[PDB]
From a paper:
Evasins are chemokine-binding proteins from tick saliva, whose application as anti-inflammatory therapeutics will require manipulation of their chemokine target selectivity. Here we describe subclass A3 evasins, which are unique to the tick genus Amblyomma and distinguished from “classical” class A1 evasins by an additional disulfide bond near the chemokine recognition interface. The A3 evasin [name]-[name] ([name]-A) bound to CC chemokines and inhibited their receptor activation. Structures of chemokine-bound [name]-A revealed a deep hydrophobic pocket, unique to A3 evasins, that interacts with the residue immediately following the CC motif of the chemokine.
To achieve this, we mutated residues Tyr44 and Leu39 in the CC + 1 binding pocket to Ala and Pro, respectively; Pro was chosen as it occurs in the corresponding position to Leu39 in several class A3 evasins. We found that the [name] and L39P mutants exhibited increased affinity to most chemokines with aromatic CC + 1 residues but decreased affinity to most chemokines with aliphatic CC + 1 residues. In the case of L39P, the affinity decreases were only small so this mutant bound to 21 of the 24 available CC chemokines with affinities tighter than 100 nM, compared to 17 chemokines for wild type [name]-A. Consistent with their increased affinity for chemokines with aromatic CC + 1 residues, both the [name] and L39P mutants exhibited substantial enhancements in their potencies for inhibition of both [name] and CCL7. In addition, both variants inhibited the receptor-mediated phosphorylation of ERK by [name] as well as by the same eight chemokines as wild type [name]-A. To validate the structural basis of enhanced binding and inhibition of chemokines with aromatic CC + 1 residues, we determined the structures of [name]-A([name]) in complex with [name] and both mutants in complex with CCL7. Identifying the structural origin of negative energy contributions at the CC + 1 binding pocket enabled us to reprogram [name]-A as a more promiscuous CC chemokine binder.
Author numbering:
A (entry chain E): 8 to 72
B (entry chain A): 17 to 101
C (entry chain D): 7 to 18, 20 to 75
D (entry chain B): 16 to 102
E (entry chain C): 17 to 74, 76 to 101
F (entry chain F): 9 to 29, 31 to 70
Write the structure that this text describes.
């Protein structure tokens, strides 16, 4: 909606702890990021530059229909 | 100045499903820019008829036939999904 | 918007022709991609793995006026 | 010296059907086999339903049943849902 | 002078379902702009009783799905877990 | 959880509407909900041309 991330995560989250990720129209966001939904229903912010974020998105995408 | 970046590469509105699966394309063709474009071989699709498409709302009412795009045809595979617009 | 995915990539792009981008499409999309909006108001699909796409997103981010 | 099971926990079970044309899933991860209670193997497809839901099941598909996978006797749910019925 | 109406057409709060189906109207009648109005023929509804309607929470009870015909919510075997 | 079982038979003048809202995905009938100056809610079908024009003329303000 109008939801951006003011802070990124420090550590690399465990692939086993992420349930999904969400899209964003972050054109007007000060910082660009990805938003992970965790198995415990929490939302975490991650920097798309880091490689582990792309790897997590890959391992979570290859699990759909 | 107002030319198309590249032939057949614009996004398309897929169909949604209450079954929690990949978003599937209604058919294997889409109107991209002013031209008609074919989805790649293997792209997930739905195969619907006129009567079904007219009865399509934002909540599932018809059982939509899942299929896979091969040579411009959405070849069915037996599976069905509750799909909505 | 939430049901908008890219089945086909651009493959062939110039930074001077892009007006904005959308970082990622839906999680439940068959193919994951970024969607660029061009100066001519057209939407193009690009593969986020390619380096030029990330460079375009970076040079397009460094163009939104931040405060002091 | 004649009437044993011949194999502990190994008799078939009536699964639940689905109008979506997918694999037949076991209601829960447990079945009453030869008077004992049995757990499906880790990874077996299952449905995760509640008492009121399973009771609200007819022969025409009407309710969305939560698909899941059997792990350690629990039908761990996953995103997917199916229109499922009893036949 | 300025407080008129415009034909029975104001919205009504439906009942929800955790199974992902159309939102259904509790009964086939609604109090719209101070009048009593009948839903259209074919409109999805729930068919509940006084005790049932009182036993409705935010899903725990099985509500009888039905279709509105001539102002009556005719049931059709199906039931859904519905909530307020 | 607010849906419209009936649309406005006639047609209302833009000068009598204060704003509009959109209804839910799981509603049996899809429509727009206009709020009138007298604080009443009317349902309108977005297919009708005057409805889209009224919503446009009410947004641009």
């Amino acid at each position: 909606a109008v939801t951006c991330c003011y802070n990124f995560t420090n550590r690399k989250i465990s692939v086993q702890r992420l349930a999904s990720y969400r899209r964003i129209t972050s054109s007007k966001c000060p910082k660009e990021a990805v938003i992970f939904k965790t198995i415990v229903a929490k939302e975490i912010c991650a920097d798309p530059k880091q490689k582990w974020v792309q790897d997590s998105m890959d391992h979570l995408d290859k699990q759909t229909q | 100045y107002d030319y198309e970046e590249a032939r057949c590469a614009c996004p398309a509105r897929h169909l949604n499903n209450t079954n929690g699966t990949v978003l599937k394309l209604l058919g294997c063709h889409a109107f991209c820019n002013g031209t008609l474009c074919t989805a790649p071989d293997g792209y997930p699709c739905y195969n619907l008829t006129a009567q079904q498409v007219r009865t399509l709302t934002t909540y599932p009412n018809t059982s939509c036939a899942v299929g896979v795009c091969m040579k411009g045809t959405c070849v069915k595979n037996g599976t069905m999904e509750q799909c909505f617009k």
